[model samples]
Target: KVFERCELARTLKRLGMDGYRGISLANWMCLAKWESGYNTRATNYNAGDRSTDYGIFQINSRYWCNDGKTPGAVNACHLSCSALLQDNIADAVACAKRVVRDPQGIRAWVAWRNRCQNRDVRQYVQGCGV
Candidate 1:
């Protein structure tokens, strides 16, 4: 699903993304914007680590999910990489939640660090009245 900017912000709000793990809605919006551009099936493969980043938040297979192909990895979320690609995003949300449950917090996503860390991210949800 390639959601419109505000549409995705509103949908994420309905999903209880605001202030999850002390990460604000704007930050989450920033994340999804950079990671997947609100596309549900987005994915990227890591050539160096032999892992793949999947779905909206691009949760990686080396630690959070199990695709049965990434060696030397743990399925901390007990999820399959395939589950993150669905249009609904509920499973992807659950896995993303589990990821920040660790000490890494939202910094688990390097995209957020590089693209969203110091920007005025409010624009992602600015007009959504969210």
Candidate 2:
């Protein structure tokens, strides 16, 4: 838990969301709290949600890589196949970037949480007008 949080902090910083990064380090931790408990090697069970929502970010397999059912799965994103399938950092970074791009949805997400008030993850995302 501690190590992954540190890595995630590093990743977000590289992406430029430093101090006043708005989003709480805990909430940043929370997504992993839901998506696979920060298991960089998690492959979700298709219990209730769509089968496609696999891996760390629970990214739909179809959205990222080829179906394992096929003889071969082409990684559309060309990300490391093993990592993407296993909830690795690469997939996590991709998912985080997506959120950073569409942060309004993040506000809605917070509305759902109601627990973690928006500390301001949306405050300074460069293109989002800091």
Candidate 3:
């Protein structure tokens, strides 16, 4: 599913993404924008790294989820990579919560660092009613 900007923002807000681990909802929106363009089925195979990034948040198989193909997989989220592809986004949101629990917090996603960090991320959730 390719979510509308406001729709995704509102959805994340309800999932407790706002102010989650000290990361704002707008920051999560920006990461989703750059990582997967808000498309839940988005998947990228990192052949060079033996990993695959899945879903709207682009959670990877290397350390976050299990796809049965990524070597040295950790499956820290304790769910299948397939769960991230669902339109519901409940599992994806849950996995994202786990990802942020690490020391890096929201910086775990490089896209957020390059595109969202210290920027006017308010534009993402500006009119989302979040």
TM-score, every prediction: 0.95, 0.49, 0.98
lDDT value for model 3: 0.94
What is the C-alpha local distance difference test score of each model? 0.89, 0.48, 0.94
Q: Tell me which of candidates 1 and 2 scores higher on lDDT.
A: 1
Which lDDT value does model 2 have at 112? 23
Better-scoring candidate (TM-score), 1 or 2: 1
Off-target runs (Cα >4 Å) in candidate 1 are none
User: Taking the candidates one at a time, how many backbone clashes does each contain?
Assistant: 0, 5, 0
Which stretches of model 2 miss by more than 4 angstroms? 16-26, 47-52, 70-81, 85-88, 99-130
Q: Per-residue lDDT for 18 in model 3? A: 88
lDDT of 3 by residue, 1-130 (tens): 9999999998898899989889888889999999999999999999899999999999999999999999999999999999999999999999999999999998999888999898998898887677
For candidate 2, the C-alpha RMSD (Å) to the true structure equals: 7.4
lDDT of 1 by residue, 13-122 (tens): 88888999998999998999899988888999999989999988888999989999898889999998999999887898888888888998999888899999988988
lDDT of 2: 0.48
Candidate achieving the largest lDDT: 3
